[PDB]
From a paper:
Pseudouridylation is the most common RNA modification and is observed within tRNA, rRNA, ncRNA and mRNAs. Alternatively, an RNA recognition mechanism that does not rely on guide RNA factors is employed by stand-alone PUS enzymes that independently recognize and modify their targets. More recent data have suggested that PUS1 is the predominant PUS to modify uridines in mRNA. The structures illustrate how PUS1 recognizes and binds a helical RNA duplex and enable the identification of RNA-contacting amino acid residues that make extensive contacts with each RNA strand to orient and guide the RNA into the active site of the enzyme.
RNAs harboring such substitutions have previously been demonstrated to act as mechanism-based inhibitors of pseudouridine synthase enzymes and have been used to demonstrate the structural mechanism by which the target base gains access to the enzyme’s active site. Although the space group and corresponding lattice packing arrangement of the protein-RNA enzyme complex was completely unrelated to the packing of the C2 space group of the PUS1D134A:RNA complex, the same RNA duplex, and the same position of two independently bound protein subunits was observed. The RNA duplex and second bound protein molecule is again generated by the application of crystallographic two-fold rotation symmetry on the contents of the asymmetric unit (which again corresponds to a single protein subunit and a single RNA chain). Structural superposition of an RNA-bound monomer or dimer from the two crystal structures produced rmsd values of 0.63 Å and 1.47 Å, respectively. Beyond providing an independent confirmation of the binding of two copies of the enzyme to an RNA duplex in a symmetric arrangement, the resulting electron density map, after several initial rounds of rebuilding and refinement, displayed a significant feature of positive difference density in the active site that might be indicative of low occupancy (ultimately estimated at less than 10% in refinement) by the 5’ 5FU nucleobase of the RNA.
Author numbering:
A (entry chain A), B (entry chain A): 72 to 119, 127 to 219, 223 to 253, 267 to 463, 484 to 493
The structure:
Amino acid sequence: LPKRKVAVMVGYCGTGYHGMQYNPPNPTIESALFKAFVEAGAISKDNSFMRAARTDKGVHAGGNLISLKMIIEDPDIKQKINEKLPEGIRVWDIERVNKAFDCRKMCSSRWYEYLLPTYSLIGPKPGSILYRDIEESKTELLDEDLESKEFWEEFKKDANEKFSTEEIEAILEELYQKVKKYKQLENAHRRRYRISAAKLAKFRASTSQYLGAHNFHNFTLGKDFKEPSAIRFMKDIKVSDPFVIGDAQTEWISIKIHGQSFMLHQIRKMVSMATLITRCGCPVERISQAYGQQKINIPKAPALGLLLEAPVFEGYNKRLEQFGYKAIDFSKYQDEVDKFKMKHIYDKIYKEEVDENVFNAFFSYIDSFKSIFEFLTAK
Amino acid sequence: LPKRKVAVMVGYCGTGYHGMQYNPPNPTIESALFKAFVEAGAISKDNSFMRAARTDKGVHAGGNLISLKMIIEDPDIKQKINEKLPEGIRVWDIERVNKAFDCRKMCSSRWYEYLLPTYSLIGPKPGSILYRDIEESKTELLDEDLESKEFWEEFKKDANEKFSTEEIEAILEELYQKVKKYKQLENAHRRRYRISAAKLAKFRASTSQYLGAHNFHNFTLGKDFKEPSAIRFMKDIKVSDPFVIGDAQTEWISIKIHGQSFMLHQIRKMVSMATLITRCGCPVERISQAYGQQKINIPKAPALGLLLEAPVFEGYNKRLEQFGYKAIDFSKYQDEVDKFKMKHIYDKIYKEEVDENVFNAFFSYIDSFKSIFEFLTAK
RNA sequence: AAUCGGGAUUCC
RNA sequence: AAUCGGGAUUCC
């Protein structure tokens, strides 16, 4: 059998793996793919290549690309690779490429998707360091939050009807059980929340303010203003209408992002900054100042909701001849990709939000901390 | 089938797991054991217990204890659990216990074992921040290192005979390949090393200075002097004679430690401090001052060499009646445990040292850093 | 991606 | 045990 270069389109669930890039001994998506290539009979041995995107730990992807030389001679090869692969990783197709094709260089654009529970937009709890800081803004009258005021007031109403004035604001048998029941009560109060139209409008205003070509040095752990890479371009960004899904009936929103290229954890930093602005009520224009002088520390959002929709290859497509090599279009798989998304990615995100408590953790930590200086009605 | 409380003795390889304690969704030794209990038919469902030691991520254990109620009615049950378990986790035996038995409380003592490559004792490289600091000690004449002087001089001799004055002390095709070949040369020079008797004597002197009852606040990430837990007692500690094992013919030493109880990463902090004292040549008595006033930051050693030999249960053994319940003695399995050690733990440590480059990483990082103030011939 | 020094949260 | 703010190393 001869060697033949080829490109493999793949989809996977990022949960339970240490990223896309091969990095032993920790199990990675590439490691599992390689293990499935020798079980189907397309790889030789020893060692060896490129990839469209290097998705971080836990990040899923409806679409990703690898490029390698394999024995593409068996008519039923992709079926064998899929039978030798776990249910959470699928190979959509195997299309041939040329020697000039570079997976990292010829990546024109990228489509990402972030699932976000709507209760992430509720303001901080009374008694938190961020609330008292926003309260300390009672000098310069900023924004006022009447929505989260009624939410936390209703939670305090429910707590006094379920507890009997237990000073359970202290921890380190039944007191453990009391505090756990209290935390479960807060989590259920968050999961019962239904977002308004004004909060969604503010969130979409910030997301729209992300659009265009800007310096994104404050949305990455990297060099500052006078760096080349910091300038990047967002082509499209859309926050979907909220929807309720799951047994717990949590409410979610889907943020679809279209970009040229991306920095380290740029998407998560952007989504976190948007949620932080929407939460306290800081002026939406304060996001533009994040492009400005003073460097700020914004923590990136949980990687659980991050999902790489698809990489685009406009440059390689146009430069392709009329006959001989097919174009790289991910829209030609939308049926199987949508089914796999719904089954293995989306449902896993819902279950892991309900159990692993990722998004509750993230914002219970934001209130106890650097980034407060930006959203403190003064910077 | 009725419920029956029991204690399971277990052994495992820590590589590829996130610790002993059950912590989903990350795969743990307890998670794999539970998955193997329902595949053999000893657990019901839903959820649920104690454990002798909570071994950190990557740490292996020739012996560990769990306690749970299971259906111990099938005569060939342990064989089924072992057939339903990966090769890297074994159940040695399943002996019954009483309701009073507490795995964490009645743990009398613990035997740990650390495998350490001898090249960890070689002093810092010329041009490192720690060398120049030890060089800055050319005022107060401390210790002088003639052993590592000839080692690094011989490496510089070999580099000039293999390279042609390439200023490859700069990085960020072939220059990458040049630097990689240079680093492989340094690693091979370390692996060819054979420890002397004086260095081993100094290492054993420090290890012996660990013995007795002392305040170990500087050997844990925790509270300082005026804390209760900091006082702990070491009963026995022995560094074995060096031995050469493996295809790469690396030289190792085995440090066996016997203690009452242990703090967070106490063993690794102790081993790292011993190696740090032996390396630069700081006075062995400086380890005693680590029990003293000034708090110091000592980084814990790689968890790869750490191996929990066995927990002891002297209190539960003596308080046991003459008939009815068997004593918890781990020495009754030494054959199978030694075979499993040699095959799955020790060989894995050797392979992971050669490949994953753990111990080379650790000490190449010590030279570039807080802890230098202790071993700088002045504190 | 992994390790380590500290600071913080969630599950333990 | 996991996440995050920075500082450092190893493999990339």
